[PDB]
Amino acid sequence: QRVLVKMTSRNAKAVERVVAELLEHARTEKVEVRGPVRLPTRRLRITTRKTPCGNGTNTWDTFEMKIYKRLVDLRASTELVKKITSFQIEAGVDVSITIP
């Protein structure tokens, strides 16, 4: 659990792209990498009446929003790890680096 990098976004394709090419950036140094972990996907739901004036049949409207989370474990020296993590980041994807 030496180095924890967590990525999360709103686009499954973008999240997968970042993880896959982060691994090749890791695979070019010979770090010890624990495989990516897919955390459970979370959906935020909001239900709202469609009408703006309260008339007619009571018809509703359900909106959703999905969030994908991935986890990667790296065991390497700090000045090295910053070099791996210096890659370009796709728009909409955030990356958090933590050490426990």
Partner 1 sequence: HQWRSRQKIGMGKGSRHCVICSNQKALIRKYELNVCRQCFRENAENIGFVKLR
Partner 2 sequence: HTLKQVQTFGKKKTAIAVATVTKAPQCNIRINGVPISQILPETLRAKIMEAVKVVGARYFSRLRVDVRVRGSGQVAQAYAVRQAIAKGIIAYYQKYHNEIEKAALKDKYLEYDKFLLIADPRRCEPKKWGRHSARTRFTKSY
Nearer to partner 2, 62 or 86 (CB): 62
Binding partner of 57, given partner 1, partner 2, RNA, none, CB within 5-8 angstroms per partner class: partner 2
- CB of residue 29 vs partner 1: minimum separation in angstroms? 35
Interface with partner 2 includes 58 (CB under 8 A)? yes
Helix H, strand E, coil C: the string for 16-61 is: HHHHHHHHHHHHCCCCEEEEEEECCCEEEEEEEECCCCCCCCCCEE
Interaction residues for partner 1, span 40-99 (CB under 8 A): 44, 46, 48-50, 52, 61-65
Whole-angstrom distance, CA of residue 51 vs CA of residue 92 = 32
